[PDB]
Write a protein that binds this ligand. Structure first.
Ligand SMILES: O=c1[nH]c(=O)c2[nH]c(=O)[nH]c2[nH]1
Ligand SMILES: O=c1[nH]c(=O)c2[nH]c(=O)[nH]c2[nH]1
Ligand SMILES: O=c1[nH]c(=O)c2[nH]c(=O)[nH]c2[nH]1
Ligand SMILES: O=c1[nH]c(=O)c2[nH]c(=O)[nH]c2[nH]1
Lengths: 300, 300, 300, 300
């Protein structure tokens, strides 16, 4: 009684660089795109008949083709267009998952103004989206996740951790002052697809950064909740936000062996291990949408 | 109505290196360990009261302590032991997810025999486990996933891909002979925890490699199914197996511009993009265990 | 006739995070430090007598100790202080090489102003230094290299490549318009150590960026020369600059198979292979200083 | 008086995968190739006249073409062939540096015999070469470096470190038993180009591993010298060998706080910082060949 279960296939990490150059002031969209189709590909696995299978090579061609034919503004719209496109090309497909990450570029400063066609990478986190489209016509449903990854941030005070559970293996001293440093990975789910994607992203990003800096932290857990709840309070169109934050320990070096004090000044920035504190903040009044999250961050 | 939803926390990437040295012939266990606790940590997020929280630093200490107290044989047993231990130490916790990677070492060859205490990394893929323990006493349940990651394999013939769906964006030529190269990521779920972990792991690994080599491939999809089904047929104790394989494209380089033939000999190994083909092989007569897979491969 | 040749040893990648907090407006210095000592360590290699050897563990302790005792302003001064320090502690040492890289942080924007103690990584290249100190007292000599690494930049026009040598293996079409994208690695050597390190670095960085953007490029070779010569013309205190630039090819995708034009708009950003164009611009009137560059970028 | 100084250019990281398939028992050569030309390319930098420049794209084409035309046996011979070829094609070039890494593959085991066309990556370090060719005809000279990179090895005893210099910043305890773990990077220079490259490589690798295992270590310094000298004593055709070894610290974890002993059994494998111990072993009766080492490991 051995059968094929869940499966998906597509092209991973299609790097597409789109330039808008209708005026001498160029704009760039720098994208990394994943496609994944789902549906009746059973025979392709069990017997090797590829009749239903649209090659991943073609899914890559389609990314580049539509980059010209449809354009690339907000990555959520581009992902939605790709999802609907593959459903129209692949009758055996029941759904498509399109994930995109965008690398931001600034203009190189020349004599106090940004150059028309010279750019430098901004380097402060990746804007992401994960779009799922299922069905066709009146039964078509779609879900949009957006997110930020590798947003590297730190507080040098305003961070405490005390009153925790102490067991026989606990050696950690309580503290009222420590560094809190992380590299934030977050994704949030929109209630519908009728959203000003760029406006909401800029506001969410600003809210997460501001809350991180200004909330007095009693634990990374409490910081993440304050960040996520501030986002949902400001954005009724967002159903839920998941946050994943390493606690990149900066250890206060003991300089007493060298005859020196260390009043919170000299730290060893440790690579591994790191705390990993992960939390979701949700609207209690809307249904969950597990289809939006299937195979996020990955299949297995 | 904004509330804390799913959450977990713990120590990530604890590198523990355990030496067995009861005799001059030492053995090594080289591990990377993640802990993650789930339970009633709501107050720790919402008000900042850490009374329920066993610090991630303590969870790190526990890995090293139990590596001596309990030893490290099969990583599945060590992960099961850590899971039960944390539930004993943290009353608010309802469950624990313990994930481990093991890096295999061989003995250095000296006059045709492995040296007593000198080793070299084996380098052929990581052995993995993901162990979840929920509840205590009679209500306790546990699940074991084991797996292999970064197993880099290739066939230089016995691979085809033809008769696929062709649309207006398709330029891929059908082929009856190509390279098939991948880096296998796989995880499988055991029906129970009464398993000879090392014997089954070694068998699964050899079935995967043997099926990959000897099965004539009509598509990566079909190779993955053939590998997965053979594992399930040889191991009734395994409920399901998920395979994730990039199709690392080796393009036959066009040498005609240089006055040369290229009959399947000279290839360009492209990095990105790559096909990503993902399949699940399951026993239809056993129920699913979503608990085993929760937050695998990640939380969000 | 087998003897020990050149050798050096020290601690690599000491991550030191220094916080200045005498006022509530904190400042951060985020550093990665390499030490390497040179001298009479022959017996330590040949017979294993470690009498001359100061442990790398101590060289690490010394980084953290001096971070408090001497402070960390410009990384060149900190590296010079470390070099002279190790010569005073290690009588067998004849020289010391201290390399440092600095990761820049900005203040998180809160209500239009930078927060007192909350920061985000700037993410636009690494400031580097390589300081070599040899001898003691009146025979002491020192050399300072500074540099930038991983400065990711791109032009979307103003870049040509034509009139090159065409041989029987050449398939490249000449072009008067292409993308030129790179990740710049550069190091330059100062004539003396009497330099305002921070002021010169900011000006050099600005000159390299401006020249990249504004010079009409006939080849990456010609761009790198225009960048390096502009730096030396503006900075008589700099003896030479070496630049190493990958040509990260952005290939104009052929969309004619899909019935579309591509007037310089849709590109495939290729990972590997990449051109690697490397050049030095030098003052013809000052002597070379090979001691400054020994074991840069590495020993072997 | 600002002038162009040293420069070189070429194609970096050309991944060529060559299959030998004269019989059904295929063999594979899996290579990463760098080309770099040196010569009279001054005009190409200063005025932008590319007449002398053979495009890096052509240099890429030449790797694939000669992989068929000439074949790929030992990477040293292939690199020598590329070096001479470019000097034939590029009159302005005075020299070429060709560097290659090879990734070893094993045959997949099927019923105790290696499969005809199914392979798995060996995973134990990269075989390397760096070949420099200068001049043409009677004035031609060439040099071959071969090497090994990322060879991950460890001993769990037979390593000590005591009797070192102790200063006011030293806290390291002397020890008579510790783990010694490293990832070896080494390059050696052949006296001539009349060498059985594969036989010598295999011998050098086994001497390095065997000496590491069996030599009782008083310091990494002394282990490296013992490895290097043994290679030179067994291979008169090798002029010199440079070794670069991180001391990847495995700290004995203090388990006393948990009521436990730890007699050399449980270790924390730290990532950074790490000792970096670098030594050259040379024949004092042969002259140096700086030309062989120019821009190794990099240009700047
Ligand atoms: O904010 C924190 N939460 C934790 O759970 C924890 N655990 C730990 O060791 N340090 C911290 N910090
Ligand atoms: O085995 C394959 N499956 C695919 O779906 C596919 N798509 C593609 O372009 N090549 C391949 N190969
Ligand atoms: O600016 C360039 N220099 C080159 O040497 C070269 N070679 C190549 O293929 N493209 C380019 N571009
Ligand atoms: O073999 C060693 N050499 C050193 O120089 C050194 N320094 C140190 O701290 N440990 C070690 N070990």
């Amino acid at each position: 009684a051995i059968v094929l279960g869940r499966n998906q296939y597509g092209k991973a990490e299609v790097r597409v660089f789109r330039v808008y150059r209708d005026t001498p002031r160029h704009e760039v969209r720098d994208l990394n795109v994943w496609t994944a189709l789902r549906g009746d590909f059973t025979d392709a696995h069990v017997t090797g008949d590829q009749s239903h299978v649209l090659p991943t090579d073609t899914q890559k061609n389609t990314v580049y083709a539509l980059a010209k034919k449809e354009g690339i503004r907000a990555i959520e719209d581009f992902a939605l267009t790709l999802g609907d496109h593959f459903l129209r090309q692949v009758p055996a497909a029941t759904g498509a998952r399109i994930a995109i990450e965008e690398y931001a570029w600034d203009r190189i400063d020349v004599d106090g103004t940004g150059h028309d066609h010279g750019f430098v990478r901004r380097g402060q986190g990746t804007r992401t989206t994960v779009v799922t489209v299922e069905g066709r016509g009146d039964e078509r449903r779609a879900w949009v996740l957006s997110g930020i990854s590798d947003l590297i941030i730190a507080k040098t005070t305003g961070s405490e951790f005390h009153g925790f559970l102490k067991d026989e293996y606990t050696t950690l001293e309580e503290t009222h002052d420590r560094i809190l440093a992380t590299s934030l990975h977050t994704r949030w789910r929109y209630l519908t697809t009728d959203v000003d994607w760029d406006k909401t992203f800029a506001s969410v990003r600003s809210i997460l950064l501001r809350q991180f800096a200004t909330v007095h932290s009693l634990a990374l857990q409490q910081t993440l909740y304050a960040m996520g709840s501030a986002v949902l309070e400001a954005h009724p169109e967002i159903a839920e936000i998941r946050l994943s934050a390493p606690n990149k320990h900066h250890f206060l070096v003991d300089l007493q062996p060298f005859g020196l004090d260390n009043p919170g000044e000299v730290f060893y920035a440790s690579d591994r291990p790191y705390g990993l504190i992960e939390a979701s903040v949700v609207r209690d009044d809307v249904p969950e949408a597990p289809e939006a999250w299937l195979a996020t961050p990955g299949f297995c």
